[PDB]
Design a protein around this ligand. Structure first.
Ligand SMILES: CCCCCCCCCCCCCC(=O)SCCNC(=O)CCNC(=O)[C@@H](O)C(C)(C)COP(=O)(O)O
Ligand code: SF4
Lengths: 112, 98, 52, 52, 318, 175, 114, 84, 156
């Protein structure tokens, strides 16, 4: 195995914390520039949720690649490459809630 | 003195007060200088025309020429100030004190 | 690349416009906006090729 | 050796003038204007978002 | 009855501008192996009216970032100044006969420039700002050479009164006397009217629409009308200055016909140039005027100052 | 009302001065300066100075052009200020307009106002002269004497302008 | 007064046209329609940020040359003097000084940009 | 303007109080975040960002993780600001 | 009723002005744009009919979606449509614009521009011939001719 950027999990965690800092400070600027109607707390909660989604990763290379992708997304947001549609896609506003209980899935459709 | 002289001298007074009361930008104070020059042109022209001082109808044009010279000097200084500080704000001309 | 089937396994199209648009930045250095329009014209980029 | 003799509390913090010249206060003073040349631009061929 | 005269000058000029749009579209099309508008009306005659109705029945949008006051004031200034400049022109008799009509026209042309700059700044759009700055550069390039050429030519007139140009050119056109100044003046008029090859402010190919990118419906129609009216007025000024016409005082219609035909020819030349040549870069335009036109204009101004003295041809002041 | 065109124009002049002197963003101050230049041209033309007034308008029209470009380059701000965007600018504008209105009504009503000099409310038409200039424009003949009488003024002004070009070049060298 | 009447008439026509353009048409103004135009994508910064003028020197020199334009306009009436020798000498002096200024700026790389 | 150690402690405690996740009652100078307050690693990063904002000096990543005690934050701030 | 007659005639005038002067915006995504240029070419010159290409969305009246609309380009297309003043009409040219065409099952293609913006006339073909596009534009003109805005205003 050849390390992408970090030879051990602790170094990757350090990189992840740096990326989280960058996003946390960028969130208010994003709300201001993109004229988003979400609050800063809401965007930072979404940032935490996106970070938490991949909290199960235990391999340093996967974490490093995830940090790279997050940095690319942050660069997109810091510039105006991503539009308000792209920024608000993280909040699935249009999509209706999907029930997760067995009975609701049984009622709604054949999907497992 | 007719009232037009009153109005033009009032305009000069207002421009002088504007120049002496800076706010942030230097361009605005250079515009107040140019306004003072315009008021002076109008006063001189009115006097010279009412008194039929024929050989003095050129004095306003020389006044305008040197007013534009002054304006050019002001802008050429403002450009250097902006380059050295990034803005035309007067608060940056603070290195020299007393 | 063919796997011996009736459908290609991989088809990669090398578009001449790709590298020219990549070099557009180097070409544009030291020029103005109209020069940039002219340089875009010179490399004859059809973006169907570039984007594929 | 101070900037002013009989210095006050506030002036005491103030440093003396430089010997030769003042240091350049160059800090993001110039921000290049960023323009979306395309896609809708007539010269962008319709599908080029040239960020200049 | 002076109000009737003002309306007679204004209304027909606007209709002339409208039909100039049709003429341009057809002339460019035929020079491009095409037929200009012909479907709408016989030989396309009613196309202008349809365009005006469409524009004035189209929603006008006020940009969110715009400064509304200047945004609205600019088209009003452009159109009013465009109509005003027509007043002093002798055709053959001027509506307003001024001792210094030429300087009046120069000042009014200077004032009209602010309409473009104010429109571009108020729009609060990057392309509009770029167009406004291009207009600033264009005025910087052309104003001095325009003034010097006009002074050099008018030295033979002996005054800045437009009417006296007819008397000066009674026996010959002034183009014969000052054909180089005439060439530089024609190019400078092209520059002042922001016409190709100096169509930099709008610059559709390079700037989506330039200063008017954020203008729609009526305000854009007003800007277009001002542009075309300025084209016609400047060409009429050239016709008066250089291509003089015979005036029989008992029959002014002859002079009016000759003048109108010459102005039509010059406007057609404008469209011809727009079709033929490509567009200059504003750096190149400024360089052309300052490095090439300005020195020759200075030399020719010296020449025209000296020539009446050395040839004992100083024109009458009155 | 046409008996006092001069007074109306002078009041417009003072209002333009109160506009560009309250120091809005250089754009609107330039608007004020342009308006004041036009009104001053009107006044000088009413007094018989057509050439001078037109020259002022032409020169200030060009001058404010360079000012506008410079503003968009150096004196620029993200939220440019109008006379109703700050309490200081609006305070200055209102104070200037009120001071005008004060002196205007004071002199118009009172026969002889005396602020710092003594001003008579009689219309400007009174002072005008009854003589005839014949086949001549006295302003034009006087302005043309700069080349026949004012050789010294021509020398000084030409040198000043050449040295001004040199001075601008040196001041903008920037080492 | 004729000039005043003509100016009023033209300005009133333009203002009436603006009124008819902003009141005759139907409007459905919404935020996205009135947003700034940046060729389809949204603007990055403002259009009120500084826009560097690469031709500043030429603009200041333009002011200084417009002064000379003002000084030279009386020439048509000047040719009516009896001292045509002095008038010609001074007019050529002014024009040669303008030429000298242009030449100096040109040779000193002042008419170039940036 | 002497930058007292107790003023630094007051500012740190105010910043910690503002953070909602920390319960005000059990907040203490010796209350370690991870165990005493139950906040997670990203929570500690956010609190460190708040502290660096309040005191205006940037805390590097290595130093920040050595934290998790408000007293530790106070002492590190004193060390950076040369207090006592 | 006389009021009905006046409304009908004024509506006729407005519709005639709008259909006679149709200014498409300079928007071409893909190969279909080339056929659009050939329509602008001398053989089928659209300027005869009053159709003049104008770049600025605010100075345009019709958007012709010529070419495939990728998921990346769709927000820009919607922005340009929104910034276009009304009355505004959309013409979808080519199979790619109409329903996705050759790239219907691609991840990066919007399966029709109808999903993003309302469409008035669909011109079939891949690429549609310039004569077909001219036919579609004339069909849009007839559709404008059939509009009854003022009559509906009077009746409402
Ligand atoms: C506007 C809102 C949009 C916000 C979008 C922000 C993003 O794109 S998040 C992308 C960054 N993703 C990551 O860094 C993945 C980190 N993966 C991991 O495994 C690590 O977090 C670890 C190893 C679980 C450690 O994390 P913890 O300290 O345990 O927790
Ligand atoms: S429909 Fe056919 S011709 Fe048109 S863009 Fe798609 S592939 Fe090209």
């Amino acid at each position: 195995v050849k390390p992408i950027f970090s030879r051990d999990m602790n170094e990757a965690k350090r990189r992840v914390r740096e990326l989280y800092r960058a996003w946390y400070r960028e969130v208010p600027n994003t709300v201001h520039l993109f004229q988003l109607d979400i609050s800063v707390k809401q965007g930072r909660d979404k940032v935490r949720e996106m970070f938490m989604k991949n909290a199960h990763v235990t391999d340093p290379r996967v974490v490093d690649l995830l940090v790279i992708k997050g940095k690319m997304e942050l660069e997109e947001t810091i510039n105006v490459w991503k539009q308000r549609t792209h920024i608000m896609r993280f909040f699935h506003e249009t999509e209706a809630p999907r029930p997760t209980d067995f009975l609701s899935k049984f009622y709604v459709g054949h999907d497992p | 003195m007719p009232l037009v002289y009153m109005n033009i001298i009032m305009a000069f007074a207002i421009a002088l007060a504007g120049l002496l009361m800076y706010r942030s930008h230097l361009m605005s104070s250079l515009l107040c200088l140019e306004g003072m020059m315009l008021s002076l042109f109008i006063m001189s022209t009115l006097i010279i025309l009412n008194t039929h001082f024929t050989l003095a109808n050129m004095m306003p044009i020389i006044l305008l020429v040197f007013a534009a010279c002054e304006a050019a000097l002001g802008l050429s200084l403002l450009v250097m100030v902006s380059n050295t500080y990034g803005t035309d704000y007067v608060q940056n001309l603070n290195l020299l004190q007393c | 690349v063919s796997d011996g089937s009736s459908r290609p396994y991989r088809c990669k199209i090398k578009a001449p416009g790709f590298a020219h648009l990549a070099g557009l930045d180097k070409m544009s250095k030291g020029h103005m906006l109209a020069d940039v329009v002219a340089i875009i014209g010179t490399q004859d980029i059809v973006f169907g090729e570039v984007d594929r | 050796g101070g900037a002013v003799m009989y210095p006050t509390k506030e002036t005491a913090h103030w440093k003396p003038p430089p010997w030769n010249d003042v240091d350049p206060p160059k800090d993001t003073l110039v921000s290049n204007l960023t323009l979306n040349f395309g896609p809708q631009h007539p010269a962008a061929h319709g599908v080029l978002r040239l960020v200049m | 009855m002076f109000m009737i005269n003002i309306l007679s000058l204004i209304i027909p000029i606007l209709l002339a501008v409208a039909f100039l749009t049709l003429v341009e579209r057809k002339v460019l099309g035929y020079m491009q192996l095409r037929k200009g508008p012909n479907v709408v009306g016989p030989y396309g005659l009613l196309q202008p009216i349809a365009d005006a109705l469409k524009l004035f029945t189209k929603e006008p949008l006020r940009p969110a970032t715009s400064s509304i006051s200047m945004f609205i004031i600019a088209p009003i200034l452009a159109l009013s100044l465009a109509l005003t400049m027509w007043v002093p022109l002798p055709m053959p008799y001027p509506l307003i006969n001024m001792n210094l009509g030429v300087l009046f026209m120069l000042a009014m042309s200077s004032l009209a420039v602010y309409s473009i700059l104010w429109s571009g700044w108020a729009s609060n759009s990057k392309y509009a700002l770029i167009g406004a700055l291009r207009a600033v550069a264009q005025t910087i390039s052309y104003e001095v050479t325009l003034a010097i050429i006009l002074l050099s030519v008018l030295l033979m007139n002996g005054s800045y009164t437009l009417s006296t140009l007819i008397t000066t050119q009674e026996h010959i056109w002034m183009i014969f006397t000052s054909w180089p100044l005439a060439m530089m003046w024609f190019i400078s008029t092209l520059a002042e009217t922001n016409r190709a090859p100096f169509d930099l402010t709008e610059g559709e190919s390079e700037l989506v629409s330039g200063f008017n990118v954020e203008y729609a419906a009526g305000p854009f129609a007003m800007f277009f009308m001002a542009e075309y009216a300025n084209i016609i007025m400047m060409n009429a000024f050239t016709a008066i200055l250089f291509l003089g016409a015979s005036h029989d005082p008992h029959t002014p219609e002859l002079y009016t016909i000759n003048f109108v035909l010459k102005t039509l020819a010059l406007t057609i030349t404008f469209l011809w140039i727009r079709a033929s040549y490509p567009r200059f870069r504003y750096d190149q335009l400024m360089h052309l005027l300052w490095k090439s036109f300005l020195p020759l204009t200075l030399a020719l101004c010296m020449w025209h100052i000296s020539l009446p003295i050395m040839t004992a041809s100083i024109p009458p002041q009155s | 009302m046409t008996m006092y065109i001069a007074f109306i124009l002078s009041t417009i002049f003072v209002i333009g001065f109160v506009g560009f002197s309250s120091k809005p963003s250089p754009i609107y101050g330039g608007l004020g300066l342009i308006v004041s230049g036009g009104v001053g041209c009107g006044i000088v033309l009413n007094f018989g100075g057509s050439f001078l007034g037109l020259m002022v308008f032409l020169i200030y029209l060009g001058g404010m052009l360079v000012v506008f470009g410079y503003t968009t380059a150096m004196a620029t701000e993200m939220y440019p200020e109008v006379w109703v965007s700050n309490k200081t600018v609006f305070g200055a504008f209102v104070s200037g307009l009120m001071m005008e209105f004060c002196m205007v009504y004071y002199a118009l009503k009172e026969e002889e106002v005396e602020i710092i000099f003594k001003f008579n409310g009689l219309g400007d038409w009174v002072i005008y002269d009854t003589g005839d200039s014949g086949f001549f424009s006295e302003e034009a003949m006087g302005i043309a004497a700069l080349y026949s009488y004012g050789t010294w003024l021509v020398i000084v002004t030409g040198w000043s302008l050449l040295i001004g070009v040199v001075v601008i070049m040196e001041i903008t060298r920037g080492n | 007064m004729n000039i005043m009447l003509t100016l009023l008439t033209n300005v009133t026509l333009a203002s009436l046209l603006v009124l008819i353009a902003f009141w005759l048409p139907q409007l459905n103004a919404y935020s996205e329609k009135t947003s700034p135009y940046e060729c389809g994508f949204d603007p990055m910064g403002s259009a009120r940020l500084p826009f560097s003028m690469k031709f500043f020197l030429v603009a200041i020199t333009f002011l200084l040359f417009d002064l000379e334009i003002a000084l030279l306009l009386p020439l048509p009436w000047a040719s009516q003097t009896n001292n045509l020798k002095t008038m010609l000498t001074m007019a050529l002096f002014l024009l040669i000084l303008l030429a000298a200024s242009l030449a100096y700026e040109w040779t000193q790389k002042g008419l170039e940009w940036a | 303007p002497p930058l007292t150690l107790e003023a630094i402690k007051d500012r740190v405690l105010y910043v910690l109080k503002l953070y909602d996740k920390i319960d005000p009652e059990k907040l203490s100078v010796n209350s370690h975040f991870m165990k005493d307050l139950g906040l997670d690693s990203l929570d500690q990063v956010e609190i460190i960002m708040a502290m660096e904002d309040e005191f205006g000096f940037e805390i590097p990543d290595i130093d920040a993780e050595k934290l998790m005690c408000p007293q530790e934050i106070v002492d590190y701030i004193a060390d950076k600001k040369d207090v006592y | 009723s006389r009021g009905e007659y006046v409304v009908a005639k004024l509506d006729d005038l407005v519709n005639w002005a709008r259909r006679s002067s149709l200014w498409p915006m300079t928007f071409g995504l893909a190969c279909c744009a080339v056929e659009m240029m050939h329509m602008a070419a001398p053989r089928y010159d659209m300027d005869r009919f009053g159709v003049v290409f104008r770049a600025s969305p605010r100075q345009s009246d019709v958007m012709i979606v010529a070419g495939t609309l990728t998921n990346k380009m769709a927000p820009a297309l919607r922005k340009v449509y929104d910034q276009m003043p009304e009355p505004r009409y959309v013409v979808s040219m080519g199979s790619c614009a109409n329903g996705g065409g050759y790239y219907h099952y691609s991840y990066s293609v919007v399966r029709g521009c109808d999903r993003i913006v309302p469409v008035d006339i669909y011109v079939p073909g891949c690429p549609p011939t310039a004569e077909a596009l001219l036919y579609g534009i004339l069909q849009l003109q007839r559709k404008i001719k059939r509009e009854k805005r003022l009559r509906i205003w009077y009746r409402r």
